[PDB]
Amino acid sequence: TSDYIIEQIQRDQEEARKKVEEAEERLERVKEASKRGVSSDQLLDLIRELAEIIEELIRIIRRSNEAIKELIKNQ
């Protein structure tokens, strides 16, 4: 509930929304490419890419989790 902390949290959350929008787009591109008579090797590539997105979104979730904990404790 201190202003520098609040400032950092708001900055992080803007980064989150931006990252989510890029991820939604990255997802859609993967979906269009995904359903076609395509070669395992490229399907293997798509799986790694989505695995990257998931791990990234989890980092965002954990950082946001920490922010909520910090805000709720400063009651």
Q: Does 10 bind a copy of itself (CB under 8 A)?
A: yes
Q: Does 1 bind a copy of itself (CB under 8 A)?
A: yes
Short-list 64, 20, 26, CA closest to 46: 26
Q: Which residues of 11-37 are buried (b: 16+ CB within 10 A; e: fewer)?
A: eeeeebeeeeeebeeeeeeeeeeeeee
Interface positions with a copy of itself (CB under 8 A):
1, 6, 9-10, 13, 16-17, 20, 23-24, 27, 30-31, 34-35, 37-40, 43-44, 46-47, 50-51, 53-55, 57-58, 60-62, 64-65, 67-68, 71-72, 74-75
